[PDB]
Design a protein around this ligand. Sequence first.
Ligand SMILES: Nc1ccn([C@@H]2O[C@H](COP(=O)(O)O[C@@]3(C(=O)O)C[C@@H](O)[C@@H](O)[C@@H]([C@H](O)CO)O3)[C@@H](O)[C@H]2O)c(=O)n1
Ligand SMILES: Nc1ccn([C@@H]2O[C@H](COP(=O)(O)O[C@@]3(C(=O)O)C[C@@H](O)[C@@H](O)[C@@H]([C@H](O)CO)O3)[C@@H](O)[C@H]2O)c(=O)n1
Lengths: 394, 394
Amino acid sequence: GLAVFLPPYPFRGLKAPYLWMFYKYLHCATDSILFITGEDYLSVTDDEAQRARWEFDPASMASLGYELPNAQSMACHEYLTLDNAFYETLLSRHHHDPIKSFSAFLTERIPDLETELHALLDSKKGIIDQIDTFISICNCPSLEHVARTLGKEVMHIEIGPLRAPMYRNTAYLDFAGVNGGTEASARYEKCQAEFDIKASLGDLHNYFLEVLPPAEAATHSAAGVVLQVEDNSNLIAYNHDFTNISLLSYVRQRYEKEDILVRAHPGSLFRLRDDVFTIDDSANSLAFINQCNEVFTINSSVGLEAILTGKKTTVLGDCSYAFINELAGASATVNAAAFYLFSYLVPFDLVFNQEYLKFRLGHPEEREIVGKHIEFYSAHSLSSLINEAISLEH
Amino acid sequence: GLAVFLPPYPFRGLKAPYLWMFYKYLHCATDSILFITGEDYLSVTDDEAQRARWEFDPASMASLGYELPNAQSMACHEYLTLDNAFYETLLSRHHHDPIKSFSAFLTERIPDLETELHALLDSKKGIIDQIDTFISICNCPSLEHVARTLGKEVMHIEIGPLRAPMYRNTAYLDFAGVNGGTEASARYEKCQAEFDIKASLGDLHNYFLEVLPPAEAATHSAAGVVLQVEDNSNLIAYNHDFTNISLLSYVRQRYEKEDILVRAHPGSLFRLRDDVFTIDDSANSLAFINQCNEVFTINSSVGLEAILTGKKTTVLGDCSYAFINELAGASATVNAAAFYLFSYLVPFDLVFNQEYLKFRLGHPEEREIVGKHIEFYSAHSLSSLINEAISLEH
Ligand SMILES: Nc1ccn([C@@H]2O[C@H](COP(=O)(O)O[C@@]3(C(=O)O)C[C@@H](O)[C@@H](O)[C@@H]([C@H](O)CO)O3)[C@@H](O)[C@H]2O)c(=O)n1
Ligand SMILES: Nc1ccn([C@@H]2O[C@H](COP(=O)(O)O[C@@]3(C(=O)O)C[C@@H](O)[C@@H](O)[C@@H]([C@H](O)CO)O3)[C@@H](O)[C@H]2O)c(=O)n1
């Protein structure tokens, strides 16, 4: 079966922080799977002092394609629960800074964590052997080390950078790292010679757009700045020490403040005062981007959007799509982006689909991977698969 | 004379960033002083695309006690100007992050900076010998190293944590460090035995309050969180890696979100969304504090305010006043705070007064220092000086 790691540790101050993926796996489940999680994920469903959370909102539920589990839905599966005192103990080893503790959880081994994991995984006999792969929603070297000892692979799975309703839903699936430490550039390097895509970057973008585009390229700001959620894993671990405020100061070295348009992240706790910069108020990030000559970001999904619409983009942090931007030729960039969208990214629902997971677990050729994504999307060389997908969809 | 260091480097994206202190020294000047600064501080006065800055606002001018210089006012003094390409070069040595470059400027030696300083300081003969002390508005180990080579002391001078109109204006003056690396705790340790202050912490606070207090201790939040300006020197260098967002997550480990009251810094670029926490909207930080049972801060001036009003205070960064909070007994805390307010802090105008600077340059006894501050404030042992000041002022 699948071993799904949904750590309960409330680093950002929220209990059961990955509850939406717990509900998505639980909704889509054909076989039993092993949850490695925390008591919180199980009791939130009945605790009334938190039904104002967004994972219980029918608009988020419909958008991610899940319904709330019931007693029978829970009982198909096995559960292993981590405890809190390791969390308390972890905080005190990092000066009671929960954000530094999160950083450590994302980027270093924690021996106590590993022992707890090793203990739960043979808490009952037969558990270990039934495990076909681990799935983790974030990088976790404690788990990756545990997985090596046992001979298990680790699929790192997260919602993608293109999302409904603006786009088809996409998801990440990467054996090395999600967001940080990814293998997207190395997968492309192995197959770049098979890519001869007869489309522009804009045509790639249109294939994935599910809406009429805004499209008012008239009136502009020389520079657009993308802000991110301040304590997102991207901004804690893979940011190269850039923050929202040093990103703005980066931009202000280069442009006067009258030439800068700044878009706060809708999900951030913080908004911009209407004092110094021109604050964007577009209904969506695509219409924000189309108002800017160039775009500056740490590692937000919106940077990919800026690259697919042809904009000069500066990417200051590590991310899965950076390598696309770093290519020289215009054609080289198109081919790298097409591999990215059609083969690195996965149609969102497949990463919760157990047979597609078995497929990826056999490490098939890039042609097979691209042919299975396009089949899902549309419901013979690799280049002609994509070229025709583009040509027919249009 | 005085050698005043007002670095022109626009780390926070603002030219002539320390312009208000340049205008305060220029207004108060009796003798010629040597400015070590940048071309920007001189041309801003005539550049019309920046008279919207707050240093030209008659309300800031009246509050800090200065008027704008004229041609004659400038001509009393000598000027030495730093150049920009060292700044450009510094940025590229820190991944073009201006906030990391600022951190380095505040906490490490920069050899190129030192050579530039050494060059300007004997650009003309006789400059060096006329220098009686350097004054710097922030810590700068390049300058401190330069000062040691030449045999000069460095006064670190900044606006204090108590400010008009809520309080008498105060200023910092410290030979080792301002904000970071201060000597306040070590000055107190040398004289603690001379301190027997017959007053409460509240009476200390009242001596400095210049307004009727708000005073509505009825209705409360278990926890108040103080946010700071995100790219302030305090939050770049002396913060122990705490940020506004990890401070909130620190508080959320300890209290539910319904028990937390959060005050953004009025000067920050960012305000809080009205979604998750109760956002304070008091007219001033004192009325915010009086609504909270305990107060959490990195190293904001408001933490001192919380300590003078008797509140349980948590201080997560380095600051000049921390040592007061770390004391055990109630009496011990009063005495440490009285030394802090009456002898560590300086009445704001004296730190621009050239004869008072000569006084401090002779390193007089704490009794002399306290007697000169109280004389300024009111216009014989150390304990009876303060006890009577408190008793008469009331
Ligand atoms: N200034 C911004 C930033 C984002 N968005 C919108 O918010 C979405 C997410 O972009 P993000 O910038 O990539 O958001 C974060 C981030 O802040 O870095 C937080 C959260 O989405 C989380 O999903 C992580 C990664 O998905 C972690 O795996 O990424 C975009 O696709 C876009 O719809 C926006 O409109 N404006
Ligand atoms: N949440 C806050 C923070 C501050 N203040 C008010 O703003 C003032 C400054 O407090 P600060 O928190 O100490 O402000 C900063 C800071 O953000 O740390 C920025 C700026 O004042 C600068 O003066 C530095 C030091 O003065 C640097 O020497 O300190 C307080 O005295 C108080 O009037 C407030 O009302 N609410």
